[PDB]
């Protein structure tokens, strides 16, 4: 029931102005604007606020250190991330944190959390439900599916169904309020 949410930026947290500026929400702001009010005991940590296209290998070191110092203190961790290099990060973190004691769930959205039709609420609810499972490891939640993080690829560039599990079964799939694993 105790969850840590770590922000890295991405479209999910994106906020655009008419002045031509591009700003970014913190993780807590993302959850609140996405309308997740059922997050009972949740902490928040803002590690980065970048377009994921900017991600470099040094960022994976930072993220892994951060994860390593929190895996014992939480029952689950969620990392919000841009979709562009999300599967790269989830892959590298999988090699860096061999055998996490908890679920570590990467997610994001194709449409900013600030828009009315965003996929952010579905993705966050999915990640949250899975961070409460007892299933240890590194995963990606997107479009109602939970996929093994080291078997995930971005497959579509302009769709809500942006990710797939490649050559491996999907871990779980949302059906109502239920994550189903078969």
């Amino acid at each position: 029931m105790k969850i840590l949410l770590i922000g890295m930026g991405g479209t999910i947290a994106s906020v655009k102005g008419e002045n031509g500026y591009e700003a970014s929400l913190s993780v807590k702001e993302v959850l609140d604007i996405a309308g997740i009010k059922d997050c009972e005991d949740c902490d928040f940590l803002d590690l980065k606020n970048v377009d994921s296209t900017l991600i470099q290998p040094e960022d994976w070191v930072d993220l892994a250190e951060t994860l390593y110092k929190n895996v014992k203190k939480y029952d689950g961790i969620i990392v919000t991330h841009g979709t562009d290099t999300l599967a790269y990060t989830s892959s590298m973190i999988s090699f860096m944190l061999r055998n996490p004691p908890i679920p570590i769930v990467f997610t994001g959205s194709m449409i900013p959390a600030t828009e009315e039709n965003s996929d952010a609420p579905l993705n966050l609810q999915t990640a949250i439900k899975f961070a409460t499972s007892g299933i240890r490891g590194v995963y990606v939640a997107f479009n109602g599916k939970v996929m093994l993080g080291v078997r995930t690829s971005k497959v579509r560039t302009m769709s809500r169904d942006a990710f797939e599990s490649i050559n491996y079964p999907i871990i779980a799939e949302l059906r109502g309020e239920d994550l189903v694993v078969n």
């Binding site: 900017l54 470099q56 290099t85 971005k154 302009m158």
Partner: protein, 127 residues
Amino acid sequence: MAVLVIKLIPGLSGDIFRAAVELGYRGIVIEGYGAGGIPYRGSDLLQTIEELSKEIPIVMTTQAMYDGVDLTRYKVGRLALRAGVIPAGDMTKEATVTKLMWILGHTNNVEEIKVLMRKNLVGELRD
């Protein structure tokens, strides 16, 4: 003539693109992330492209399988365009590579190549 296809990965530098140009490659395709773009901080890749894109065509497609690129959609895209990157639109990777090859077979004028790549020649592209 000779085309090189390079996948964009985190931390990829511009030095191999210089080497490619020096080696006599007449075109380069970059498979970017998502709807396409070049990282503007964290590497010299963008600066390198600004320079090279006026000497040979630099084409951007996506590493994803479906929906293709749209360099107007994001800042990383708009800067790639500013830097002279030619978008591949919704073309397949096979169409992108072969189309560039075909074009290079009868012009090396970069701005001419740019126009051709963006024109639907035979049904490969939505222009």
